[PDB]
Curated annotation (Swiss-Prot):
Keywords: Hydrolase. It is an enzyme of class 3 (hydrolase). Hydrolyzes diadenosine 5',5'''-P1,P4-tetraphosphate to yield ADP. It comes from Escherichia coli (strain K12). InterPro entries: ApaH, Calcineurin-like_PHP_ApaH, Metallo-depent_PP-like. Co(2+) is a strong stimulator (100-fold increase in rate of hydrolysis). Mn(2+), Cd(2+), Ni(2+), Mg(2+) and Ca(2+) are weak stimulators; the two latter act synergistically with Co(2+). Its EC number is 3.6.1.41. Belongs to the Ap4A hydrolase family. GO terms for biological process: nucleobase-containing small molecule interconversion; response to X-ray; RNA decapping. It catalyses: P(1),P(4)-bis(5'-adenosyl) tetraphosphate + H2O = 2 ADP + 2 H(+). The keyword Repressor does not apply. Monomer. One of its GO terms (molecular function) is hydrolase activity. This is Bis(5'-nucleosyl)-tetraphosphatase [symmetrical].
Length: 269
């Protein structure tokens, strides 16, 4: 069976309880995770240890909080007490866990399922070939010995409009924002980097990225997490918003792909 779970955010107990509910069995089953494995919840260390131990039984994409953790680890960004990352940062296997984390993908594709997953979704300005090339470019910088330089370069809100002509810092910044921060678009597909509200509460003319028809969404299903204020609701057919806000006091959601059956674990917070 194939299971897809939204943002875990250190909610180790809820993750394990949800996997027991579906009798997840590595070697018979595969787990997809939308990213944001860490921060806010109490168990980021246990979450990373477990997810790494799954090997080929898990398909992860990196989220914005995963990248922030890497930036803190690398001395690029300051640790926020609210993120509850110190046990992970001080763990004896921190290097092993975080060097594994920075090598994980930004994008997962299964052609037999016609299924695409990224943390925030796929911007309507990208076709599949472009999304794959952009994922490969940022994965390359994150997997390299010089990854702290990129992590520092990644911060920024512009450019917010994709072009194949983009180069350098702006190209990397856009790619990072599209895969890990995107929620709303202007009518032309350009990214808004400020509104984090639900679609009904957003100021005009902003619309959810998935409300603008794009080439990837026309041919593939897209699963994503990230957008907690969406509450996993209000999406079109073929769009699966899996982040139901577990670390916020909401729920952890698991979707089984074969029958599109949902399983939900209440937050312990
Ligand atoms: N049910 C909800 N109803 C309404 N507002 C909700 C709900 N749940 C959370 N919020 C708010 O939604 C903000 C972003 O929290 P989030 O988890 O959605 O996303 P995130 O973890 O990536 O954090 P953020 O850095 O803000 O997003 P990014 O910059 O685009 O990258 C948080 O203040 C949170 O009060
Ligand atoms: Mn999140
Ligand atoms: Mn996120």
């Amino acid at each position: 069976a194939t299971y897809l779970i939204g943002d875990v955010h250190g909610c180790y107990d809820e993750l394990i309880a949800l996997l027991h509910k579906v009798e997840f069995t590595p070697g018979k089953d595969t787990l997809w995770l939308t990213g944001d494995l860490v921060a806010r919840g109490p168990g980021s260390l246990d979450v990373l240890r477990y997810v790494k131990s799954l090997g080929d039984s898990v398909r992860l994409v990196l989220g914005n909080h995963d990248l922030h953790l890497l930036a803190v680890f690398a001395g690029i960004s300051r640790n926020k007490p609210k993120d509850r990352l110190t046990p992970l940062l001080e763990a004896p296997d921190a290097d092993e866990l975080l060097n594994w984390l920075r090598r994980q993908p930004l994008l997962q594709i299964d052609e037999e399922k016609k299924l695409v997953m990224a943390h925030a979704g796929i911007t309507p300005q990208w076709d599949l070939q472009t999304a794959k090339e952009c994922a490969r470019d940022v994965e390359a910088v994150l997997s390299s010995d010089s990854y702290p330089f990129f992590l520092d370069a990644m911060y920024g809100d512009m450019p917010n409009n994709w072009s194949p002509e983009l180069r350098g810092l702006g190209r990397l910044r856009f790619i990072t924002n599209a895969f890990t921060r995107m929620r709303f678009c202007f009518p032309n597909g350009q990214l808004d980097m400020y509104s984090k509200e639900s679609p009904e509460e957003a100021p005009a003319p902003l619309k959810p990225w998935f409300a603008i028809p794009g080439p990837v969404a026309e041919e593939y299903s897209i699963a994503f997490g990230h957008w907690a204020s969406l509450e996993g609701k209000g999406t079109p057919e073929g769009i699966y918003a899996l982040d139901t806000g577990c670390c916020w006091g909401g729920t952890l959601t698991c979707l089984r792909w074969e029958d599109k059956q949902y399983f939900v674990q209440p937050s312990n917070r």
